Ligand binder design. Structure first.
Ligand SMILES: Nc1ncnc2c1ncn2[C@@H]1O[C@H](COP(=O)(O)OP(=O)(O)OP(=O)(O)O)[C@@H](O)[C@H]1O
Ligand SMILES: Nc1ncnc2c1ncn2[C@@H]1O[C@H](COP(=O)(O)OP(=O)(O)OP(=O)(O)O)[C@@H](O)[C@H]1O
Ligand SMILES: Cc1cn([C@H]2C[C@H](O)[C@@H](COP(=O)(O)OP(=O)(O)OP(=O)(O)O)O2)c(=O)[nH]c1=O
Ligand SMILES: Cc1cn([C@H]2C[C@H](O)[C@@H](COP(=O)(O)OP(=O)(O)OP(=O)(O)O)O2)c(=O)[nH]c1=O
Ligand SMILES: Nc1ncnc2c1ncn2[C@@H]1O[C@H](COP(=O)(O)OP(=O)(O)O)[C@@H](O)[C@H]1O
Ligand SMILES: Nc1ncnc2c1ncn2[C@@H]1O[C@H](COP(=O)(O)OP(=O)(O)O)[C@@H](O)[C@H]1O
Ligand SMILES: [Mg+2]
Ligand SMILES: [Mg+2]
Lengths: 680, 680
């Protein structure tokens, strides 16, 4: 058993009662000098390294060719100038086991951390050598982390798609179902996670033409999708809670389910308008609807109408077919299923669209895997083979997360947010998906990105602030207001520079101006002195700066229809020495076994004299955690991946009280603690 | 219990030992006077009937509008002039329960047998009132029976496709698999039976791009197809026996199969070149091949190359990957599976293509459900969404069967064959399938039809000839030679009249002339005096008439790439008072229960003094039955649906001896005794 593993397990052998947290600095030193350093191919020079990597199909050629090799050498030297040392064993382990380029035979390391960062920065900068240096520092300071699809692939031959997160609308016809099956498979062969809105399909037992009682309904299309995802080497289906098939749709995921209905590779999510929550609160018997009878009567997809305005009219219209259900028992059933499987992802639709900027394009109708992406969409119609299709707007999103601790310690909220936006914008412009025409069309027209944040708990706990305190909410209120400020500002700058906006920008609340109402009348500077000191050295936007930005946006518009969303962070959390996303930590010390050995990872920064501040999530009050997320969500234009952390000692009514409280506080999406393609 | 059922069961109460065969004439009289006649809507006049049926969406309007109502009345009167009486209870039962148009609420009969026949004849004739009368007599004399898709639908609103039999090629890409899934579903929603050739898909464990060992293989695509056929309200997959996946492909249909592999709605068929039979005879270890390694090496689909010429070259080529198998044990496994499920359909490919007329278009590579359709085909390539597709040639076939007994007693081999061809040609020209571009293209280009025959055993047994005798083979040799003669003659006539041929006709053996070699040098007039007397009154073509037809075809060409094939006959066998297809009968008297009552159907014509001639199939020598089919097959340009009738007392080696003997005699396809869409 290796020496680095030796020192690693010595953390758990207590000294003066204390753990041996410093042993892990030894373990990662041992892991390099006695292993990594000896399986890293080392070349006589960089040109020899790069020439080898281009000539052997490891790297791509075009992006490097945009630079003079004297400039490529300066960029690499910038990365190595940091003298970056991993502070823990598992952080270095996760980079070399999951991200570092290895040889085709997988026996030696071709990339150090500085090499992958230099290649990504050379790709983002697209010829601008100084910008590449700017990107190298931002990544080697660990201020920004592009998503794993982007961070892993950039500059590689045999490179997978930089974007791996997709959402699809499906129209109510056999042509459209067949095309969604193929798009699902085409995106999935590229490694994408695909989420499909099934709310427009007609329900079980609806007419086809004049044959009554002929439709298989939503579950039939889930069976076909489940199979498509099996064949092509993970997907999701969303359903509106007022769809008649909602119960059958949920039942496909009971672990006890029969195999006549069992769907096994599909996540599910449920979309809940306000009208449902009112009906469940009132314990009033509610109706769910056969969507095609609504279509034949109103000429519109039920999915495209406002259920808060239309519910009573649908109930009274005799040509609309409906079914009675118990809303409380359905709500309880959602709590049960989430205990089984984490999902169904719950989306509070009116909490999304109350503050949505682009309802003019459409209401937000569904979300992606782990449910942080919230964008407008319009269904296509794929017509008969001899006829022209009508291409709508699907959704794809390009993700990255800034690292809150290093952004605060570098006092670089503005510079990081603007640079990371530039990088996400470059990934969006170099994407061309084939065989998914509405994804391709929406990416050019909407130009949407998703910048997030990680290390919230880590940063708070290392500055003596409990995750559940009002001080923590006061830090989050200001920090994410500032992120949003410079994000909007950089998007308007790019709009002025390029002279374009996203298509139909002028219909958005950014153009009509009401997006800015709370920012020009309410101050978001800290209410607590100790929190305000954290921001010393950085200007905090006032209502006057917001007024001038409102005016700026009014003149130049905006390049991006959406900018911010907080995805989960996977393995890369280790590499960044960062607590996952904006969630509280789950364990103070993780014990995981790898190859007949046990490894220990204490939370980034865990010391004996801050132990109290790394409070484990399952011991926290979820009603206070909801308060924190609702605070961040004010300043995030899309969504926040939000897992509740619950003891099995929770009654089904305690669970629904959390649900109702989340809804009350304006939370957009929620589930309980397969998303791999849609995580940073 | 009704009176017709009363008299019906009295057949089985013996008199002087004899059965009471005449009771069934009473039973069908009782069934009319005491039931059918009282649930038939009767109108004051025909115009009142027709106007009702057009105004209430029962009938279509366009085809009737091509006639003056004075002519529609003459055609109907022609049908009723026959005074057609069903000779048995079950024959009338099957027409009114399965074919006669009932009201939308299914409570009364809108069509007598004379009405359905008049409507079909008005449709076939397409305005030619005299031709409609010709069609009415041919159908009411029960000389010709169009297939159930055609006979049931013609002239109806909400009418299904007249053709319901389709065969598809599938190319080796995800694009093509997705398109085959959609075509399968589009054809299947129209009621079609769909057969797909899977021999071009690469095998389990082949490369995708440069990822080695990445393919799911043929079984993965069967799982998706199985699901497509489930969703859309029966299909078949064919595989060449030299495909590496052959064993896994067969195993999906073991009744004991695991549900990780179980395919439940798909028939299967196996395509066997001569080289395999030689290898199994020699008990020599044989190889099966990974098709993509052959493609990467030879630039051609293994499916498109001649395995008899290429086998040894494939084995020696080191860049071709193969696997060893035991051919005898594989042959035995085919016998086992056919005992379980009737299928896999076996196709002896070189027996098909030795005599195929259009190898210039392609070799025949596979067949349909119940395996009588044998036509050339060329695979499409459905490319990326933004790119043009390359449309090949799929197959669809329009079926009908003449009724041998009534054709002989009317001495009308020529008139029936030529008229039935006209009708099948009209169904082909009025088909336009959407969402299946290679089916649509091949139907216009190939103009293929499939005219068959029924009542072979019935006719033989009623003329004192045993199905297994050399006299019976001598009658079949002549009768089907004459069918083929007038079929080719009428196709050449239509070619002269229209001035067209099927596309690329001049490459066929009809054009180069060698199709006719045996007919200009061998005489097919009867060798037995008693058989020759059966043909008295009809001219039997001589080698001189064949020489003049050869010359005729040479000048005018041919309209149809294929003309003859003998499908099974389903329920319509009852309506025609006919033994099924060209098969021997299975039971002298069928006992079936319907609605708490037992019904008896003696074979059409079964009398006590011909009992010996209605020998039951399971008591016959299958080696003699093979001899009969091989005799008919000489004069049929496509195939003959051929079920072996076997006792469970057959060793697995007895079964393979039949297989080898069928192959020896030139049989094209065979299986053991779901085809509903591809039966007359
Ligand atoms: N395998 C490798 N071998 C050598 N340098 C590498 C390799 N991988 C990355 N580099 C980086 O390339 C940069 C330039 O490397 P190189 O060895 O060519 O120059 P040097 O000898 O250090 O300095 P100079 O180019 O001024 O002589 C350095 O920052 C080095 O860390
Ligand atoms: N429901 C029906 N009522 C009447 N005739 C029908 C009906 N269905 C079919 N027919 C057929 O329509 C044909 C013409 O029928 P119709 O009753 O109009 O004429 P008719 O009185 O028998 O003779 P004519 O037209 O010379 O007076 C007949 O052959 C009849 O069998
Ligand atoms: C063909 C078919 C469709 N469907 C579903 C798919 C769609 O959600 C829905 C409608 O299919 P469509 O393909 O739109 O049918 P249609 O256009 O012929 O008829 P209509 O005018 O009523 O739309 O029915 C089935 O459930 N089973 C089937 O076999
Ligand atoms: C994408 C994909 C294809 N396949 C099968 C379908 C086809 O039979 C075969 C090839 O798929 P293709 O779609 O043709 O793949 P490709 O063109 O990218 O690669 P190549 O040049 O090697 O053709 O692989 C799978 O088995 N699983 C998959 O996930
Ligand atoms: N924690 C670490 N993170 C990254 N690289 C490391 C780490 N520890 C050791 N290495 C690598 O191993 C080399 C040998 O380590 P060492 O000689 O102890 O440090 P230094 O070179 O700073 O004196 C370092 O130069 C470095 O490239
Ligand atoms: N075997 C049968 N096949 C068809 N129709 C029949 C049959 N038996 C009776 N019918 C119908 O019932 C009617 C009443 O029968 P019946 O009066 O016995 O015969 P007919 O009218 O020839 O004297 C017939 O006109 C005929 O339309
Ligand atoms: Mg439709
Ligand atoms: Mg390919």
């Amino acid at each position: 058993v290796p020496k680095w593993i030796q020192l690693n397990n010595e953390i758990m052998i207590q000294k003066d009662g204390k753990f041996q947290f410093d042993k892990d600095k030894e373990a990662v030193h041992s892991y390099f000098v006695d292993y990594i350093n000896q399986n890293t191919v080392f070349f006589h020079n960089l040109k020899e390294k790069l020439d080898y990597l281009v000539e052997n199909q490891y790297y791509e050629e075009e992006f490097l060719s945009l630079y003079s090799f004297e400039d490529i050498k300066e960029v690499f030297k910038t990365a190595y100038a940091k003298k970056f040392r991993f502070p823990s064993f598992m952080s270095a382990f996760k980079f070399y086991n999951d991200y570092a380029l290895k040889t085709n035979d997988k026996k030696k390391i071709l990339e150090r951390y500085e090499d992958r960062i230099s290649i990504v920065a050379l790709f983002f900068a697209n010829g601008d050598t100084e910008k590449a240096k700017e990107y190298v520092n931002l990544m080697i300071n660990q201020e920004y982390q592009p998503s794993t699809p982007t961070f892993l692939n950039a500059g590689r031959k045999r490179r997978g798609e930089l974007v791996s997160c997709f959402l699809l609308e499906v129209n109510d016809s056999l042509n459209d179902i067949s095309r969604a099956i193929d798009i699902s498979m085409q995106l999935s062969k590229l490694g994408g996670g695909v989420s499909l809105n099934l709310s427009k399909l007609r329900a079980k037992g609806e007419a086809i033409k004049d044959v009554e009682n002929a439709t298989k309904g939503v579950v039939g299309v889930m069976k076909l999708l489940d199979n498509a995802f099996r064949y092509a080497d993970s997907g999701a289906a969303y359903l509106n809670i007022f769809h008649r098939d909602i119960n059958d749709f949920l039942d496909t995921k009971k672990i006890s389910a029969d195999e006549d209905v069992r769907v096994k590779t599909l996540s599910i999510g449920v979309v809940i308008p306000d009208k449902f929550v009112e009906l469940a609160r009132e314990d009033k018997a509610a109706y769910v609807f056969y969507p095609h009878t609504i279509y034949k009567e109103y000429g519109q997809h039920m999915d495209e109408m406002d259920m808060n305005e239309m519910y009573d009219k649908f109930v009274d219209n005799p040509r609309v077919k409906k079914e009675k259900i118990n809303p409380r028992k359905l709500l309880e059933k959602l709590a049960m299923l989430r205990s089984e499987s984490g999902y169904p992802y719950i989306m509070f639709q009116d909490n999304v669209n109350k503050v949505h900027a682009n309802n003019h394009i459409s209401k937000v109708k569904f979300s992606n895997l782990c449910s942080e992406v919230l964008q407008a969409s319009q269904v296509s119609s794929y017509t008969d083979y001899d006829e022209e299709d009508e291409i709508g707007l699907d959704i794809s999103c390009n993700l990255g997360s800034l690292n809150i601790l290093n952004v605060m310690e570098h006092k670089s909220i503005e510079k990081t947010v603007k640079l990371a936006t530039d990088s996400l914008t470059h990934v969006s412009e170099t994407t061309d998906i084939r065989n998914a025409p509405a994804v391709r069309r929406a990416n050019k027209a909407m130009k949407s990105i998703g910048l997030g944040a990680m290390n919230l708990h880590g940063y708070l706990a290392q500055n003596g602030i409990a995750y559940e305190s009002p001080e923590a909410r006061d830090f989050a209120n200001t920090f994410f207001m500032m992120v949003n400020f410079y994000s909007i500002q950089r998007s308007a700058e790019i709009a002025k520079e390029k002279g374009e906006t996203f298509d139909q920008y002028e219909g958005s609340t950014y153009a009509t101006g009401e997006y800015f109402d709370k920012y020009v009348s309410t101050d978001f500077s800290p209410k607590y002195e100790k929190i305000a000191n954290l921001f010393e050295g950085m200007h905090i936007p006032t209502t006057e700066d917001w007024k001038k930005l409102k005016a700026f946006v009014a003149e130049h518009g905006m390049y991006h229809s959406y900018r911010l969303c907080i995805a989960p962070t996977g393995s890369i959390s280790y590499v960044q020495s960062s607590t996952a996303s904006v969630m509280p930590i789950m364990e103070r010390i993780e014990e995981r076994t790898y190859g007949n050995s046990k490894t220990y990872y204490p939370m980034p920064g865990l010391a004996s004299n801050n132990w109290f501040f790394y409070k484990e999530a399952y011991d926290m009050d979820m009603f206070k955690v909801v308060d924190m997320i609702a605070t961040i969500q004010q300043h995030i234009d899309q969504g926040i991946s939000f897992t509740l952390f619950l003891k099995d000692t929770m009654t089904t009514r305690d669970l629904n009280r959390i649900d109702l409280y989340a809804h009350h506080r304006g939370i957009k999406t929620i589930y309980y603690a397969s998303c791999l393609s849609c995580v940073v």
